[PDB]
Amino acid sequence: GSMASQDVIKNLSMNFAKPLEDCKKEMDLPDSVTTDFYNFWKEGYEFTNRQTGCAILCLSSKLELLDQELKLHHGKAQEFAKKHGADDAMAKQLVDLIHGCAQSTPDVADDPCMKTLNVAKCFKAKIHELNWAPSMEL
Numbered sequence: 001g002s003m004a005s006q007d008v009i010k011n012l013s014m015n016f017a018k019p020l021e022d023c024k025k026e027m028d029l030p031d032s033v034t035t036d037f038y039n040f041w042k043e044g045y046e047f048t049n050r051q052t053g054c055a056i057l058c059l060s061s062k063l064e065l066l067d068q069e070l071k072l073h074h075g076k077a078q079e080f081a082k083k084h085g086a087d088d089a090m091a092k093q094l095v096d097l098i099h100g101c102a103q104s105t106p107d108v109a110d111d112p113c114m115k116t117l118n119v120a121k122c123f124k125a126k127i128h129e130l131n132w133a134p135s136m137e138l
């Protein structure tokens with residue numbers, strides 16, 4: 001049921017967010033990214049700025065979910081999801097949701113941080129629509 005699917009997202013999210021303090025230190029990210037992560041799954045919450053996108057790219061990179069062009073590694077993102085409780089079907093759906101979101105998000109400004117932040121917003125909305133958003137912070 002919806003709560004068990006939210007717990008997979010919850011598990012994925014906490015694991016994804018673990019090295020955030022290291023990404024903050026390494027890239028001199030501002031304290032607002034920690035707030036944005038705390039509120040990541042809050043309905044209606046609007047992200048501060050592109051630095052939250054920089055934080056998402058760093059976390060992805062640390063989990064080696066990015067390829068050389070700072071784009072999602074589909075196979076590695078799938079396996080990440082499965083190691084944190086997703087079945088093959090759910091893992092594939094999540095990768096499809098991110099990919100769709102990347103495709104419907106043009107990077108006109110050559111700004112991966114902004115683009116990643118817009119991909120994240122698109123992804124968060126899709127998860128909310130599936131009622132797969134947990135009520136717990138990162």
Ligand SMILES: CCCCCC/C=C\CCCCCCCC=O
Pocket residue numbers: 009012013016056057060070071072098099102115116119120123
């Ligand atoms: C559970 C926490 C998930 C937070 C949102 C992560 C979304 C995208 C990661 C960034 C990768 C896609 C952005 C680059 C476009 C190409 O692929």
